Amino acid sequence: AACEPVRIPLCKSLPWEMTKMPNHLHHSTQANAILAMEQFEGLLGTHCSPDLLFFLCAMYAPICTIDFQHEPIKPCKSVCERARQGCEPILIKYRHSWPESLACDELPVYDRGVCISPEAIVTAD
């Protein structure tokens, strides 16, 4: 299984352009990841967390590395936590819940100890 370009529209604005399946939702093809991501357009529009996009894209289309072949690197537990703390209340307010598949507590890979996180960037309008 080799790398493939990211094709999730909402994720193209992020830093990396190469991903590899299966992703962290266990989708075998990116076509399934694309469909899955569409469900988040509304929550993303509420700006409940500046880290929600990064977290979702790190889960649905993880950056490709030659190390970690079967289970790609994952977003840091701390980033998942920031996203959940900011967005779960909004989901709740609208009679929905944070999905178990995005639970932060069992996010980390046993015996690994490395993850990816966002970093401040220089931007304007």
Place this chain on the structure above:
Amino acid sequence: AACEPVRIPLCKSLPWEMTKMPNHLHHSTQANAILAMEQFEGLLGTHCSPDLLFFLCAMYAPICTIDFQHEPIKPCKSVCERARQGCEPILIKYRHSWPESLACDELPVYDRGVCISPEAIVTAD
């Protein structure tokens, strides 16, 4: 340039094993990064920071990705700050300071927005 195996002794205990040059000290070959790490054996031995090893290896032998061809992914500024916070006082006590090459303010690649960080593993050993 393509990935190459990590050969710095002290970094082999880390999660990844494939890196790519130049590293973040601008070494063209890993051979020179090896000589450098040797100089940090003393500081690493004081256990002034549990993040120092990760930080130094993230700088001297960064994880290989297909993305970021010319400048590999860097360790997060926050990981650098924790390592400097715990270790700088020790360097000062013995008339040294945090080196210019490892300045934390220089880690963010301002038009990128992603970095690598360590994360706790679940162990009792």
